[PDB]
């Protein structure tokens, strides 16, 4: 199961 | 026993040629079970092991959107890194990301992972305490302050502590017939003459899973590791692995040499000899 | 620093166009627009980040938005319909993180009407406490009544001796209709100010009920005899009684 | 396809008692779940943020839980104070149509009312005169317990607003009140509150 | 930019036997950047329908790929793997040794 995350640099 | 789940990501930019190439793969131990390629006609996460195909459609949609969203975030991150490092939009650059969890023999969390590399060098990595970051340079510290402000580590810690372990245990039970049933190596020893005075004793280990294995030559119960030509473990192409170790023995001394094979699928460490 | 939105209220006719302004918080590069109607609740419209449109919901093509260089945002609602009457909120976050919070402004309440002849300001009255209430209890309850106004964009505030007071104040949460079966019927709103009897029986205390009414703006023409029902303050007052 | 549902649409709890607010959503793939407070006149304020993989989050008297598998969330407020009166909104952040997109989806909310403890009530119906009129009067039902359900006008010529709490902070005196008025000549304050269940021990002055 | 030279291994999935269908593997690893040209050769000619695994990397971020096709080895047919990479002055050819 992949993680759900949007974390732009 | 000890097990792991990992997700690998690679984004490579091709300016002027179009969108960056994005490829992500998932691994339980040494078994690839999911993949997503941006150059694939099917723009979806594909199954790569049989035990993941029992997952319903809701699962395959979620993994596809996450992969697509990671492709878009990497696209933006590459442009962001050009700004942080003051690089031209003409060169091609690489963004890699790895995350996952190790579990011990009791199924509890051993270690949580999340790290990013830019052009092959470490960029930013979550520490073992899952509550702090290691940044490679000042450019990565820009990202770190933003991730600290946005509480990125709190979500990663929750995933690594919960969903990552719980779903790795789920995969291990569903694919127990392969993930927890080690494949013993089929082994043999070959003899290859070099001169009229010497020859090569090559010890083979084939079809074994997982990849961890120890091939060692011994002359009369003495380690010949110093003079063993040992090849890196390699995939056979059918989810198993291969390896071999060779020694140069004097002609007529072959029976003094023994190949010892250690592997979790072997109920007893093998001791092979040249058999003509 | 918080999210600011202008104007606070908007009452205009169908087919008109309005523009809603928003200033995000300092440091926030992304702006969000939401529509909170009675029929659908809070609904996502559009998201901009550093001038560029990032996300879009079920926004109509007659609804346009923009984020400017200063990060402030504008929402243009054209060809207005009755269904566009809603509370339009603006939000902003630091970036595009899935892990952090969006911060909201106070919103812009928009009212769209078929005809603007139903627009009237309120008529405000102040009612002095019953002397029976002053003997039974030693307390004095004033009652303010704002009547005959439409639409229901009103803010009632009590002012004692020139300062607004909130202790001992209760205002109804929603105006009630005078003709309940009519959707363009006038509204009425009541409010109570309870003080101590000794405080009311001191004639040097000034009590004022102030209703801020929001009506028609400059973007609406007025071709009628009745004074143009614009945004205005209508007040009633009373002093103490020995 | 993401839709958020909250039960109940409105709730009235006694002051001091713990409460629970429910929420459910249709799509288990979410980025985060939030509980908001919306106050009329003011805007929205995020009270709690639960990450995608968290189970609970705590802030003072607030405790929220997340169960993505069942798509449900619960906000627990301990020691309900009158200041907790607001509409509580349940929001989920989940992907949108585009890759990398996200959006808040909101439930219709739960209007929470924390009725204060009305000990020693003194129900009465007073009549008030207009400061600029002698023929204009209003009827005031005040100081009844919060159990009394007031009802709207018996005749369309009359207008009755429902109950409402005022807090005289200086002497810690909170009281219920409702006003009624009409243009009718025979508009007596006795017949004004004649459709509502008025307590019999109600002081009806001259 | 860090650049790393590929390590090349040419081998068969099963112990080769003349006339028996098999798979010719070319396992390249330890290289960076990811883009790489890998061809399988039969008597110096470019083999068509060569498949390759999905790109992955190691702890040190070095990539690895497996290229493979279905082949049938004979006594006479010489098989090889041709790899070209930015870190190479010219393509590197590794002949298949059935003993390795």
Set out the fold topology.
The complex is a heteropentamer of chains A (9), B (276), C (242), D (206) and E (100).
Chain B lengths: L2 E10 L8 E8 L2 E7 L8 E2 L9 H29 L8 E10 L5 E10 L2 E6 L6 E3 L2 H12 L2 H23 L1 H4 L6 E8 L4 E11 L5 E6 L9 E2 L3 E2 L5 E10 L6 E6 L7 E3 L4
Chain C lengths: L3 E3 L2 E5 L4 E6 L6 E8 L3 E9 L2 E5 L6 E5 L5 E5 L8 E8 L9 E2 L3 E6 L9 E6 L2 H6 L2 E11 L4 E7 L2 E3 L3 E3 L4 E2 L9 E10 H4 L5 E8 L18 E8 L3
Chain D lengths: L3 E4 L2 E5 L4 E7 L6 E7 L5 E8 L4 E4 L2 E6 L4 E6 L8 E10 L6 E5 L3 E6 L8 E7 L6 E6 L15 E3 L3 E5 L4 E10 L6 H4 L14
Parallel strand pairs in D: 2-11
Antiparallel strand pairs in D: 1-3, 3-8, 4-5, 4-9, 6-7, 7-8, 9-10, 9-11, 12-13, 13-16, 14-16, 15-16
Subcellular location (chain B): Cell membrane
Family (chain B): Belongs to the MHC class I family.
Membrane topology (chain B): Single-pass membrane protein
What can you tell me about this protein's structure?
The complex is a heteropentamer of chains A (9), B (276), C (242), D (206) and E (100). Chain A is low in regular secondary structure and 9 residues long. Chain A has no helix or strand. Chain B has 276 residues and is of the alpha+beta class. Chain B has helices at residues 57-85, 138-149, 152-174, 176-179; strands at residues 3-12, 21-28, 31-37, 46-47, 94-103, 109-118, 121-126, 133-135, 186-193, 198-208, 214-219, 229-230, 234-235, 241-250, 257-262, 270-272. In chain B, β9 and β10 (198-208) form a beta hairpin. Chain B starts with a strand and ends with a strand. In chain B, 38% of the residues are buried. Chain C has 242 residues and is mainly beta. Chain C has helices spanning 131-136, 197-200; strands at 4-6, 9-13, 18-23, 30-37, 41-49, 52-56, 63-67, 73-77, 86-93, 103-104, 108-113, 123-128, 139-149, 154-160, 163-165, 169-171, 176-177, 187-196, 206-213, 232-239. In chain C, strands 2, 4, 5, 6, 9, 10 and 11 form a 7-stranded mixed sheet that branches. Chain C is globular, with a radius of gyration of 22 Å. The chains are: A little secondary structure (9), B alpha+beta (276), C mainly beta (242), D mainly beta (206), E mainly beta (100). Chain B: Disulfide bonds join 101-164, 203-259. Chain B: It holds the Pfam family C1-set. Chain B: It is a single-pass membrane protein. Chain B: Residues 185-271 form the Ig-like domain.
Radius of gyration of chain C: 22 Å
What is the radius of gyration of chain D computed over CA atoms, rounded to a whole number of angstroms? 22 Å
Strand % of chain D is over 45%
Q: How many DSSP E strands of chain D?
A: 16
Give the total of beta strands of chain C: 20
Name of the CATH superfamily of the domain at 4-115 in chain D: Immunoglobulins
Number of domains of chain C: 2
How does the helix and strand content of chain C classify structurally? mainly beta
The CATH class assignment of the domain at 4-115 in chain D is Mainly Beta
Strand content of chain C: over 45%
Biggest sheet features of chain C: 7 strands, mixed
Summarize the structure.
Chain A is largely without helices or strands and 9 residues long. Chain A is 0% helix and 0% strand. In chain C, β14 and β15 form a beta hairpin.
